[PDB]
């Protein structure tokens, strides 16, 4: 029966880890978009006149 209990625990923990990784990926994409906008603003408004 120990194989059964270990299998249940392993699959649950793996599912939780997968969910966390997916959330991290979404957040990374959003942060990339925001930083691209910030870099554009810094490059165009500081070094020149808009």
């Amino acid at each position: 029966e120990a194989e059964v209990q270990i299998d249940r625990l392993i699959t649950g923990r793996l599912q939780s880890l997968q969910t966390y990784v997916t959330q991290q990926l979404i957040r990374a994409a959003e942060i990339r978009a925001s930083a691209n906008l910030a870099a554009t603003k810094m490059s165009e408004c500081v070094l020149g006149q808009s």
Binding site: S43, E44, L47, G48, S50
Partner: protein, 49 residues
Amino acid sequence: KRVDFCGKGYHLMSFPQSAPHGVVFLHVTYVPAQEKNFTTAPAICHDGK
């Protein structure tokens, strides 16, 4: 007219080329050099004007 969008410096034109899964731009820029020092003033007074 926006600075640092196509190339580095003032912009003249560009030419596109194809790629296996994308596009490649060739930008033609303009860069000055060989400077001097001189001396400057903001305005010139003459006859009170």
